[PDB]
Design a binder for this molecule. Structure first.
Ligand code: FMN
Length: 399
């Protein structure tokens, strides 16, 4: 069915539908598909689903000039920990990724691959199964109760990365970025948000190191900046974007309770723009909004008013994508896009509406999303959401 008490608003007379150039890509509009894990990848091998992947993406790449940011993908075996999330380190993985990339392109849309590294968010059992470590910045702070229960049951303790293992992850980043480009992706996105490894180093609560990787705004931000600097040399700055979540609390991150949280992030921005002046300006900066501090909280739940993302605009002068409870607040997006370099990432509503863009343009009703199939091994709740026409044919009230 459609969203019940939702009063849609046509957004075609806004900047959301004005073209803009991101990297080498020329989008026909500014409503992007943010990275979304759906757990349909095949085990073993973390192979992208060969039965439904192309169809799912293809349905979403229907409105021409759309920028699609893929589900997070592990850059390596030690970077993962989820059996059904896809990888981007093997041939078997890349063969299926090329098919995907082609279909999106055939529909005249673009595709950026999110490079993923779990850190303490990965299941220790899975890693221990395959003889892998349970990595993280520190080893005297854990994610949560069950995460430590799992870790010990499987006798796979949290391991503080050495400077050499940190370098190894950087190797793995470059390579994954190359195979993504080599396979035909328009560029990659560095996931340095939602509490995964990179964020785990940025954050003062999770990072209690004393070396060159801990102890100061400069040191915490070091691992993140070294990936940006490594990927920029391997595939070029206009094929590299960074995703951050300043006020995120997901996966045990500090957020607005950390009095120095803003200073930590203003520092990352300042350095990104520094490089921008040196010619090397990243394709974008993706920003998860405080509106949502936890993706698995209903729209409206986990809203942080004590903080804002606006400060980034003062430092970074490039394109900035914003994701966070925008679908049901067109009146908010209206104001937000009045700014000239801002894109809106729609997540939960891009799952249920493969034709979201047109619905957004025309202020047409939205399809309710089924929270239960987000992470299901099924095609249902995956590729079977109907477009407006079909919902009308189904009679989701209007026959
Ligand atoms: C099913 C699901 C999976 C997600 N997977 C990822 C992920 O792989 N990486 C990422 O950084 N964000 C992920 N997100 C967060 C989205 O990118 C987006 O920021 C979030 O849904 C908030 O926007 P919304 O209100 O439009 O959904 C996910 C969200 C959902 C609901």
């Amino acid at each position: 069915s459609f969203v019940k008490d939702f009063k849609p608003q046509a957004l075609g007379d806004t900047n959301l539908f004005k073209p803009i150039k991101i990297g080498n890509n020329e989008l026909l509009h500014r409503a992007v598909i943010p990275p979304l894990t759906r757990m349909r990848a095949l085990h073993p091998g973390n192979i992208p689903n060969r039965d439904w992947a192309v169809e799912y993406y293809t349905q979403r790449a229907q409105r021409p000039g759309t920028m699609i940011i893929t589900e997070g993908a592990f850059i390596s075996p030690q970077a993962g920990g989820y059996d059904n999330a896809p990888g981007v380190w093997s041939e078997e993985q890349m063969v299926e990724w090329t098919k995907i990339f082609n279909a999106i392109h055939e529909k005249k849309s673009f595709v950026w691959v999110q490079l993923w590294v779990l850190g303490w968010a990965a299941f220790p059992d899975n890693l221990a199964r395959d003889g892998l470590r349970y990595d993280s910045a520190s080893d005297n702070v854990f994610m949560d109760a069950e995460q430590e229960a799992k870790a010990k049951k499987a006798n796979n303790p949290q391991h503080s990365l050495t400077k050499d293992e940190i370098k190894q992850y950087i190797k793995e980043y470059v390579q994954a970025a190359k195979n993504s480009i080599a396979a035909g992706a328009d560029g990659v996105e560095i996931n340095s948000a939602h509490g995964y490894l990179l964020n785990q180093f940025l954050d003062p609560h999770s990072n209690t190191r004393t070396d060159e990787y801990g102890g100061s705004i400069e040191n915490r931000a070091r691992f993140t900046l070294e990936v940006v600097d490594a990927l920029v040399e391997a595939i070029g700055h206009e094929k590299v974007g960074l995703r951050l979540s300043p006020y995120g609390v997901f996966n045990s991150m500090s957020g607005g309770a950390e009095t120095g949280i803003v200073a930590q992030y203003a520092y990352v921005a300042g350095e990104l723009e520094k490089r921008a002046k040196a010619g090397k300006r990243l394709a974008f900066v993706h920003l998860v909004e405080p509106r949502v501090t936890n993706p698995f909280l209903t729209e409206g739940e986990g809203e942080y008013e004590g903080g804002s993302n606006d400060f980034v605009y003062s430092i970074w002068k490039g394109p900035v994508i914003r994701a966070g409870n925008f679908a049901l607040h067109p009146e908010v997006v209206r104001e937000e896009v009045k700014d000239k370099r801002t894109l809106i990432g729609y997540g939960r509503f891009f799952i249920s509406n493969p034709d979201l863009v047109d619905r957004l343009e025309k202020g047409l009703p939205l399809n309710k999303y089924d929270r239960d199939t987000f992470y299901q091994m099924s095609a249902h709740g995956y590729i079977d959401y109907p477009t407006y026409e079909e919902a009308l044919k189904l009679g989701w009230d209007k026959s």
